[PDB]
C-alpha cells in the first residue's frame, strides 16, 4: 500500500505529505491549483500522497495535460490566450521555462525597452534605482 516515494509527471513526490502540498513540488503548480486539480479528480486533498494507486496517478497526469477540458475555469491557468495558437494553456517544468525564455527573446529581437532592460540586468517594472537594487562592491575615492 504505502509508498514513501511516488513519481508524478517526472517529479518524485514525498509520501508523508498531504496530497495538496505534495503536488506543489512540481514547477508550475501552486497550492491553489493543486487543490483545484484534487477536487476535480475526486480525491480528498488531505489524504497522504503515499496511498495513491496507478490509475489515480494516471488520472491526475491526464488532468494536468488539459485542465480546461476537465472543468477547470479558464481564468485559473498560468498561460491564457497563448501568443501563437490563441488557446488557454497550462505549462509545467521544461516547457514553461522555454516558453518564458521565448517570450524574453521575442522582446529582445524587436529591441523593445523591456528587452534592453532584460539584457542589461536592470529593473523592468519602473522602480527607482538611485538608492536600492545595489549589488556590488564599494568604490573608493
Amino acid at each position: 500500500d504505502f509508498r514513501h516515494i511516488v513519481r508524478v509527471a517526472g517529479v518524485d513526490l514525498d509520501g508523508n505529505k498531504q496530497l495538496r502540498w505534495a503536488l506543489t513540488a512540481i514547477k508550475g503548480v501552486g497550492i491553489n491549483f493543486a487543490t483545484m486539480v484534487c477536487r476535480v479528480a475526486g480525491l480528498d486533498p488531505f489524504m497522504k500522497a503515499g496511498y495513491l494507486t496507478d490509475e489515480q496517478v494516471k488520472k491526475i497526469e491526464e488532468i494536468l495535460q488539459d485542465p480546461v477540458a476537465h472543468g477547470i475555469p479558464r481564468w485559473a491557468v498560468n498561460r491564457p490566450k497563448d501568443y501563437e495558437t490563441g488557446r488557454d494553456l497550462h505549462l509545467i517544468t521544461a516547457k514553461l521555462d522555454m516558453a518564458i525564455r521565448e517570450d524574453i527573446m521575442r522582446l529582445r529581437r524587436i529591441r523593445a525597452y523591456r528587452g534592453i532592460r532584460h539584457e542589461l540586468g536592470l529593473p523592468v517594472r519602473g522602480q527607482r534605482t538611485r538608492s536600492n537594487f545595489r549589488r556590488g562592491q564599494t568604490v573608493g575615492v
Binding site: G86, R109, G140, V141
Partner: protein
C-alpha cells in the same frame, strides 16, 4: 516558421475591422482603441494609408510616441521623436500591439567614472 498572432496569419489580420482586431490585443490596447484616436493619430494614420496607396514618397516623422502599432503599418519606416532627434524604426510583424515610444529610448546608457570629492564620509 510563419508569423501568427492568435492563430491568424498576417493577411488575415489585414482584412479585419478595427473593432474585430481589438478583441485580440491586450486589455490596455483594447481600451485605448475603444476610446478612439486623438486628432494627431488621425493625421498620422492618414499619412500612413496614403503612403501605402503608393503616394507620399517621403520620410514619415512624428511626435506621436503613444501611437499603437497596427498590422497595416508593417513594412514601413517611421522616425519617432525621442526628445531631441528622430530615430528610424523598421516595423516588424512582431511589433503589433506596442507603442511607438517603446522603440525610441530617451536616456543614454550610463558609464560611471571615478567618484568625486564628497562621495564618502572621509572624502568631504
Amino acid at each position: 516558421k510563419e508569423f501568427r498572432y492568435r492563430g491568424y496569419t498576417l493577411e488575415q489580420l489585414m482584412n479585419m475591422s478595427l473593432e474585430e482586431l481589438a478583441k485580440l490585443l491586450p486589455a490596455r490596447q483594447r481600451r485605448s482603441l475603444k476610446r478612439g484616436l486623438t486628432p494627431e493619430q488621425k493625421k498620422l494614420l492618414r499619412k500612413i494609408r496614403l503612403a501605402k496607396k503608393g503616394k507620399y514618397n517621403k520620410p514619415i516623422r512624428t511626435h506621436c510616441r503613444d501611437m499603437i502599432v497596427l498590422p497595416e503599418m508593417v513594412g514601413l519606416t517611421i522616425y519617432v521623436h525621442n526628445g531631441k532627434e528622430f530615430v528610424p524604426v523598421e516595423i516588424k510583424p512582431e511589433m503589433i500591439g506596442h507603442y511607438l515610444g517603446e522603440f525610441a529610448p530617451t536616456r543614454k546608457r550610463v558609464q560611471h567614472g571615478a567618484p568625486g570629492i564628497g562621495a564618502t564620509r572621509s572624502s568631504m
